[PDB]
Amino acid sequence: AVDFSAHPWKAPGPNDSRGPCPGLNTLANHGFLPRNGRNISVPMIVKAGFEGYNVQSDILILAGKVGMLTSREADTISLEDLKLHGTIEHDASLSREDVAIGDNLHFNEAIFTTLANSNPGADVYNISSAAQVQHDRLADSVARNPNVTNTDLTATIRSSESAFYLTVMSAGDPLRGEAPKKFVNVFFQEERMPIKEGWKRSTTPINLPLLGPIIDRITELSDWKPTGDNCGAIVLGPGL
Amino acid sequence: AVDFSAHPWKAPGPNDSRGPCPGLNTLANHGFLPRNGRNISVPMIVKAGFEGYNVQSDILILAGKVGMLTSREADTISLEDLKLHGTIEHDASLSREDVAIGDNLHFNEAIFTTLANSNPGADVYNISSAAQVQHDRLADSVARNPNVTNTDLTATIRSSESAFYLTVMSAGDPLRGEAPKKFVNVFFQEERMPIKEGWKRSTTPINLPLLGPIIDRITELSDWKPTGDNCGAIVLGPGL
Ligand code: HEM
Ligand code: HEM
Ligand SMILES: *[C@@H]1O[C@H](CO)[C@@H](O)[C@H](O)[C@H]1NC(C)=O
Ligand SMILES: *[C@@H]1O[C@H](CO)[C@@H](O)[C@H](O)[C@H]1NC(C)=O
Ligand SMILES: *[C@@H]1O[C@H](CO)[C@@H](O)[C@H](O)[C@H]1NC(C)=O
Ligand SMILES: C=C(C)[C@H]1CC=C(C)CC1
Ligand SMILES: [Mg+2]
Ligand SMILES: [Mg+2]
Numbered sequence: 001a002v003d004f005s006a007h008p009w010k011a012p013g014p015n016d017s018r019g020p021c022p023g024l025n026t027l028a029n030h031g032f033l034p035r036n037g038r039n040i041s042v043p044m045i046v047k048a049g050f051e052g053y054n055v056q057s058d059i060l061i062l063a064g065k066v067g068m069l070t071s072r073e074a075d076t077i078s079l080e081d082l083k084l085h086g087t088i089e090h091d092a093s094l095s096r097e098d099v100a101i102g103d104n105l106h107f108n109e110a111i112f113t114t115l116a117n118s119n120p121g122a123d124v125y126n127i128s129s130a131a132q133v134q135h136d137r138l139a140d141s142v143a144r145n146p147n148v149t150n151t152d153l154t155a156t157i158r159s160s161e162s163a164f165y166l167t168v169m170s171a172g173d174p175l176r177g178e179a180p181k182k183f184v185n186v187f188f189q190e191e192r193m194p195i196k197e198g199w200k201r202s203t204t205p206i207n208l209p210l211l212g213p214i215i216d217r218i219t220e221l222s223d224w225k226p227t228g229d230n231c232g233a234i235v236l237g238p239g240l
Numbered sequence: 241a242v243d244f245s246a247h248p249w250k251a252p253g254p255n256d257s258r259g260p261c262p263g264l265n266t267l268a269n270h271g272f273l274p275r276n277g278r279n280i281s282v283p284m285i286v287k288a289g290f291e292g293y294n295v296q297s298d299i300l301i302l303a304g305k306v307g308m309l310t311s312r313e314a315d316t317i318s319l320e321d322l323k324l325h326g327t328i329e330h331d332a333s334l335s336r337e338d339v340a341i342g343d344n345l346h347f348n349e350a351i352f353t354t355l356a357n358s359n360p361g362a363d364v365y366n367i368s369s370a371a372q373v374q375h376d377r378l379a380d381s382v383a384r385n386p387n388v389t390n391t392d393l394t395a396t397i398r399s400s401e402s403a404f405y406l407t408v409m410s411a412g413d414p415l416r417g418e419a420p421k422k423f424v425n426v427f428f429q430e431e432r433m434p435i436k437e438g439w440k441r442s443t444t445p446i447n448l449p450l451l452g453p454i455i456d457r458i459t460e461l462s463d464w465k466p467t468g469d470n471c472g473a474i475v476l477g478p479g480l
Contacts, residue, residue: 041314041315042314042315043314043315046314057314061312061313061314061477062476062477064314065305065308065309065314065315065477066309066476066477068305068308069305069306072301073301074281074282074283074286074297074301074304074305075281075282075283075305075315153473231469231471231472231473232471232473233393233471233472233473233474234473234474234476236302236306236474237302237305
């Protein structure tokens with residue numbers, strides 16, 4: 001916010017709604033979004049992402065409104081709703097399992113290994129490592145998931161999510177496209193803003209113009225190719 | 241509510257935002273939605289469709305949230321925003337032209353001819369006529385628009401829209417899947433509820449269970465086939 005000291009991290013309780021997005025889960029665990037994770041509107045996401053991370057409305061409105069499709073309510077979601085497969089949620093996640101063969105909702109340390117072990121011999125993750133992780137995660141899904149979906153759209157969302165962890169959890173300039181491993185690991189493993197570790201909210205606005213070239217570079221380095229249908233169709237609502 | 245006396249039709253003025261949907265335009269021209277056609281949220285569409293037409297929240301939430309994707313705002317649209325090609329707006333409209341060869345926004349009497357001349361020798365449009373119109377409209381697009389998009393999704397939306405005019409503008413039971421031509425023609429040509437002509441809001445709720453078999457029947461009778469890749473992908477936001 002202005003005031004991070006008024007936004008302590010608290011572990012979610014068993015009935016606090018959490019989803020497959022560490023970004024939104026983290027905001028909830030700090031009360032930038034409701035701690036119960038319910039009745040969350042796009043305006044609330046925009047405000048929360050601005051205050052918590054300095055992520056601007058352009059990307060939060062675009063993603064937010066697509067996320068709204070995952071609930072049965074007119075204008076809000078539960079965070080857990082976002083797990084709806086094929087709206088935003090996708091195979092070859094960084095920290096979750098593919099829904100056809102596992103839990104697509106909760107953090108999974110065994111999946112996270114790949115990201116956790118990336119960019120050996122640095123204390124940062126950095127675009128080339130992000131690209132290698134994506135390549136490796138997708139290969140894992142192609143090897144082990146008979147229902148794998150991999151399209152231009154999923155590939156692009158995947159690169160966006162990598163650009164998010166690199167920029168939002170950065171030490172200095174999110175432009176640099178690298179983040180301390182100690183910040184990113186806390187972000188994923190605990191869904192906590194690593195304040196005591198030394199993280200501060202970006203003073204640079206994180207918007208689509210800033211993210212665009214980072215996303216494209218990750219995609220390009222990931223040596224990604226179409227594998228199948230390549231139809232970028234999203235699921236438009238629950239229980240269809 | 242049921243106070244239609246408080247909801248007179250007024251022609252839209254020059255600043256009043258209108259879109260490619262007669263259903264929503266008509267609600268605005270009666271002040272069930274803002275007459276200016278701006279800052280329209282899904283809750284407002286739900287309320288407006290209920291009061292004006294007895295259309296229930298199931299379909300209005302589903303379609304409403306997809307419609308929200310067409311603006312740059314967090315949780316509202318302008319009615320004209322709904323013209324964004326490839327979100328909901330589609331080729332082979334009943335009353336508008338394909339965007340690649342014409343105006344996909346405004347009512348067009350020459351296009352509407354096909355619908356207007358359908359079901360010869362009855363004073364109602366019905367499911368078989370609705371199906372023949374769709375077939376003929378699509379054939380026209382395939383003949384004259386080399387960029388035609390025709391998919392399972394567009395076919396479904398098209399059949400939904402036909403089910404809408406048949407049900408919302410019905411004389412008695414929307415279940416019957418037929419509407420007086422004098423009601424439907426006023427609906428399209430003037431974006432007015434034909435109260436003068438004798439129309440009343442349905443006393444039967446119009447919801448997905450009621451529309452579902454009508455939609456399926458229209459599709460079945462329309463001798464439909466997909467075009468090209470048959471990719472049901474929607475455009476996710478403006479100016480991507
Ligand atoms: C704006 C609204 C947002 C929505 C609706 C949203 C939704 C989602 C969804 C549904 C996923 C699951 C994708 C998957 O891995 O299968 C996801 C993943 C992710 N989100 Fe968000 N998100 C939003 C904002 C943010 C923000 C502000 C950040 C900031 C860091 C962020 C970071 C991430 C990351 C890193 C993942 C990757 C998860 C993984 O691969 O294990 N998101 N998001
Ligand atoms: C409330 C009852 C509704 C009725 C009776 C209705 C009726 C119709 C009809 C009959 C058409 C076909 C026009 C044509 O083909 O020329 C149409 C088109 C359209 N409607 Fe609706 N509609 C309703 C609600 C909605 C909602 C909630 C949305 C989105 C939020 C929406 C968005 C559209 C769009 C984008 C089109 C353009 C499709 C095209 O022809 O390319 N409508 N509507
Ligand atoms: C997953 O793939 C198998 C074929 O290998 C298929 O039978 C099954 O229906 C798929 N599951 C889903 C969720 O579509
Ligand atoms: C529609 O009306 C025509 C003309 O009366 C009729 O021949 C046709 O069977 C009707 N189709 C229906 C009821 O589906
Ligand atoms: C679709 O329209 C674009 C407009 O630039 C054109 O390049 C493309 O050839 C068209 N596809 C056809 C004609 O099938
Ligand atoms: C650039 C595109 C297609 C966007 C689609 C939706 C999300 C979540 C961000 C990227
Ligand atoms: Mg996933
Ligand atoms: Mg159209």
